[PDB]
């Protein structure tokens, strides 16, 4: 009812906090992906 | 017939032309079509392998059938082209990246 516990001391506390803000930026090339060198399946993609 | 790949001892009608390095070209190996720069390898083949592949399962080396010399393929040079623009209404003038 009548306690209370007052600090007599300090600690400066230096922690870390660690946040991503940015990802790899990264880009695909459609045909050379899906038909690398072949003409023939660039041509079929076209209709897709 | 087995046609997987391999050192093939049958093989159809077909002429072979000169072996040019260094440039893009299309290639015919053995049936083995594609288009890229041939370069000398280093890789060391065993005799019973005729190409080697990449962790796509691409043909990235190949022997050689008459000199058996191993050949690195690399795909011919290719990227994206971005244009920069100041505008339409400000100029018709870009540049190419
Ligand atoms: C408050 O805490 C600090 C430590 O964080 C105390 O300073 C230490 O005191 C002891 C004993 O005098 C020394 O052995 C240490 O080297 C001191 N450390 C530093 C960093 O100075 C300080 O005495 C405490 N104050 C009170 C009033 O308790
Ligand atoms: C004081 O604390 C005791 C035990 O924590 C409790 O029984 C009592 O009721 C408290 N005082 C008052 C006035 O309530």
Known sequence: ?48 | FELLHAPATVCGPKKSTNLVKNKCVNFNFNGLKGTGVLTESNKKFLPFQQFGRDIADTTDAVRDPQTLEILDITPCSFGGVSVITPGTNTSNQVAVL
């Open chain 1, 1 to 48: 009812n009548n306690s209370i516990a007052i600090p007599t001391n300090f600690t400066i506390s230096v922690t870390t906090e660690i946040l991503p803000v940015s990802m790899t930026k990264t880009s695909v090339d459609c045909t050379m992906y899906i038909c690398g060198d072949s003409t023939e399946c660039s041509n079929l993609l076209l209709q897709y």
